[PDB]
């Protein structure tokens, strides 16, 4: 599924991300924009052989199992395929684990390089939430 901007903002809020670990909703919407262009089915293979999955491009080296990332962990205890669903529950629940683990949203390189420090409220401006 490709979410609209305000549609994703609302879904993320319903799933408890607004101000989760102190990160306002706009941070999460911005991260999703630049990670996946709001496409739940986004995948991208990394040079180390791991793969990023879903609307927040969660990586198989640590967070999910795809059976093809040698030496990796599955800290969210889910198949990576679960991160591709039109329903964002699995991605959100895993993202909550990730952002709680010490480095906050810096875990998402695109957030750090493109959202951090910017007017992220713009991503939710005008939306019914
Ligand atoms: Cl949009
Ligand atoms: Cl947009
Ligand atoms: Cl915001
Ligand atoms: Cl594996
Ligand atoms: Cl393969
Ligand atoms: Cl594990
Ligand atoms: Cl699995
Ligand atoms: Cl933080
Ligand atoms: Cl930007
Ligand atoms: Na894994
Ligand atoms: Re939902
Ligand atoms: Re719903
Ligand atoms: Re909010
Ligand atoms: Re990415
Ligand atoms: Re990534
Ligand atoms: Re690896
Ligand atoms: Re703003
Ligand atoms: Re909402
Ligand atoms: Re509201
Ligand atoms: Re809501």
From Swiss-Prot:
> Which residues are listed for substrate binding in this entry?
101
Domain C-type lysozyme: from-to ranges:
1-129
Q: In which tissues is it expressed?
A: In the egg white and polymorphonuclear leukocytes.
Q: Disulphide bridges in this chain?
A: 6-127, 30-115, 64-80, 76-94
Q: Which reaction does it catalyse?
A: Hydrolysis of (1->4)-beta-linkages between N-acetylmuramic acid and N-acetyl-D-glucosamine residues in a peptidoglycan and between N-acetyl-D-glucosamine residues in chitodextrins
Q: Which UniProt keywords apply?
A: Allergen, Antimicrobial, Bacteriolytic enzyme, Disulfide bond, Glycosidase, Hydrolase, Secreted, Signal
What are its E.C. numbers?
3.2.1.17
Q: Name one GO cellular component term.
A: endoplasmic reticulum
Assembly, in brief, is: Monomer.
Family from the record: Belongs to the glycosyl hydrolase 22 family.
Q: What is this protein called?
A: Lysozyme C
**Gene this chain is encoded by:** LYZ
């Amino acid at each position: 599924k490709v979410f609209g901007r305000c549609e994703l903002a609302a879904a993320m809020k319903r799933h408890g991300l607004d101000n989760y670990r102190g990160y306002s909703l706009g941070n999460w919407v911005c991260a999703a924009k630049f990670e996946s262009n709001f496409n739940t089915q986004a995948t991208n293979r990394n040079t180390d052989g791991s793969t990023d999955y879903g609307i927040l491009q969660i990586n198989s080296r640590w967070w999910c199992n795809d059976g093809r990332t040698p030496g990796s962990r599955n800290l969210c205890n889910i198949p990576c395929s679960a991160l591709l669903s039109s329903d964002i529950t699995a991605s959100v629940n895993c993202a909550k684990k990730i952002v709680s683990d010490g480095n906050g949203m810096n875990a998402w390189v695109a957030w750090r390089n493109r959202c951090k420090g910017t007017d992220v409220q713009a991503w939710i401006r005008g939306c019914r939430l």
